[PDB]
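To the team - chloride ion complex, inputs and output below.
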Amino acid sequence: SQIQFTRHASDVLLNLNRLRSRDILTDVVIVVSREQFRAHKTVLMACSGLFYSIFTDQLKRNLSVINLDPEINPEGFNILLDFMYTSRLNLREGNIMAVMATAMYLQMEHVVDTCRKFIKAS
Ligand SMILES: N#Cc1cnn2c(Nc3ccc4c(c3)CCC(=O)N4)cc(N3CCC[C@H]3CC(=O)O)nc12
Ligand SMILES: [Cl-]
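Output:
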């Protein structure tokens, strides 16, 4: 039975976000209407059913650009991408509906569950 390091996973994630912030080894650009966001495909797959289903497929494995659905709110996507890399979700009454629709599209069931609880507690 192995020694558990309770802070390790959070430390790795912090460093993955630092790599994203310095554009180190990012391998995809997500185009959301007039905005673009660079990221690591590995993190996108790890956090989203949509990105998992795209990049596990050898047909799409090597794509360097992904164009999201035209109606996806870029603010909602930006908040979710930050969530992926930080474990912190920037939810408020002013963005709840946009964040919820985007998380349903991205297939992020725990975030959708949290959005539903935010509405229930409102
Ligand atoms: N190699 C690999 C690899 C990389 N990413 N990834 C994911 N990503 C994934 C897929 C879907 C969702 C989310 C993440 C976020 C929440 C959501 O609504 N959907 C899942 C996964 N597995 C393997 C067993 C079943 C599943 C995990 C499980 O459902 O218990 N394998 C991998
Ligand atoms: Cl989730």
